[PDB]
Amino acid sequence: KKLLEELETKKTTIEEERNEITQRIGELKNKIGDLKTAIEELKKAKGKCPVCGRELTDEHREELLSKYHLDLNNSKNTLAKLIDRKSELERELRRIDMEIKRL
Amino acid sequence: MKKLLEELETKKTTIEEERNEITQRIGELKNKIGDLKTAIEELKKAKGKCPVCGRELTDEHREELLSKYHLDLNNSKNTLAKLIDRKSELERELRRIDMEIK
Ligand SMILES: [Hg+2]
């Protein structure tokens, strides 16, 4: 019985992880999108920001570019890892059920 | 005669020059129109800071800037519609000058 209890609790723990990961994947995609369109605009700068109009030097443009591309890649590496993790948790869930149904 | 002919050739050329400048305006204009649409798209994303350079972008400045860009966008589209119609007309006149020339 306590075995069943532990399985049921482990199952809710997995679903919580899977639901949080699902939410993280969505946010990361939004972030990745924002980074790309930001990098796009930034490349059009030539002394002034094309979005807000304020002064933006080639030096800063460049640095802002390096920073955003580093943020973009890291977010894509995390996205990929999140996807794999979600797929793994789904197999665990199917398996945790397997054990339950039996008991 | 020979002077009528000259006048016809000289007018033909002034029309091609007009037609060629409008063509160039249209190209620039279109690119300015795409730039305003992309600047507005990014600007709609601001919430305290400019999403592009990270500077402070207050909600008040965002709306004002959004007003200016929308205003320049619609106008640019106004001029563009006009230039295209003018160019279409100049080409009508060019075809008409050639006839007169035969
Ligand atoms: Hg900016």
UniProtKB/Swiss-Prot annotation, chain A:
Record function comment: Part of the Rad50/Mre11 complex, which is involved in the early steps of DNA double-strand break (DSB) repair. The complex may facilitate opening of the processed DNA ends to aid in the recruitment of HerA and NurA. Rad50 controls the balance between DNA end bridging and DNA resection via ATP-dependent structural rearrangements of the Rad50/Mre11 complex. The ATP-bound conformation promotes DNA end binding and end tethering, and alters Mre11 nuclease activity. ATP hydrolysis promotes both Mre11 activity as well as HerA/NurA activity. Also has reversible adenylate kinase activity.
Entry's free-text remark on domains: Binding of ATP induces a closed, compact conformation of the Rad50/Mre11 complex. ATP hydrolysis opens the complex. The two conserved Cys that bind zinc constitute the zinc-hook, which separates the large intramolecular coiled coil regions. The 2 Cys residues coordinate one molecule of zinc with the help of the 2 Cys residues of the zinc-hook of another Rad50 molecule, thereby forming a V-shaped homodimer.
Origin: domain of life: Archaea
Domain Zinc-hook per the UniProt entry, residue ranges: 4-101
Natural source organism: Pyrococcus furiosus (strain ATCC 43587 / DSM 3638 / JCM 8422 / Vc1)
Family of this protein: Belongs to the SMC family. RAD50 subfamily.
Subunit structure: Homodimer. Forms a heterotetramer composed of two Mre11 subunits and two Rad50 subunits. Homodimerization is promoted by ATP binding.
Protein's gene: rad50
Protein name in the entry: DNA double-strand break repair Rad50 ATPase
Native organism taxonomy: Archaea, Methanobacteriati, Methanobacteriota, Thermococci, Thermococcales
Binding site for Zn(2+): 49, 52
Curated annotation (Swiss-Prot), chain B:
Binding of Zn(2+), residues: 50, 53
Domain Zinc-hook: 5-102
Family: Belongs to the SMC family. RAD50 subfamily.
The protein's assembly and partners: Homodimer. Forms a heterotetramer composed of two Mre11 subunits and two Rad50 subunits. Homodimerization is promoted by ATP binding.
The protein's role, per its UniProt record: Part of the Rad50/Mre11 complex, which is involved in the early steps of DNA double-strand break (DSB) repair. The complex may facilitate opening of the processed DNA ends to aid in the recruitment of HerA and NurA. Rad50 controls the balance between DNA end bridging and DNA resection via ATP-dependent structural rearrangements of the Rad50/Mre11 complex. The ATP-bound conformation promotes DNA end binding and end tethering, and alters Mre11 nuclease activity. ATP hydrolysis promotes both Mre11 activity as well as HerA/NurA activity. Also has reversible adenylate kinase activity.
Domain notes: Binding of ATP induces a closed, compact conformation of the Rad50/Mre11 complex. ATP hydrolysis opens the complex.
Protein name in the entry: DNA double-strand break repair Rad50 ATPase
Native organism taxonomy: Archaea, Methanobacteriati, Methanobacteriota, Thermococci, Thermococcales
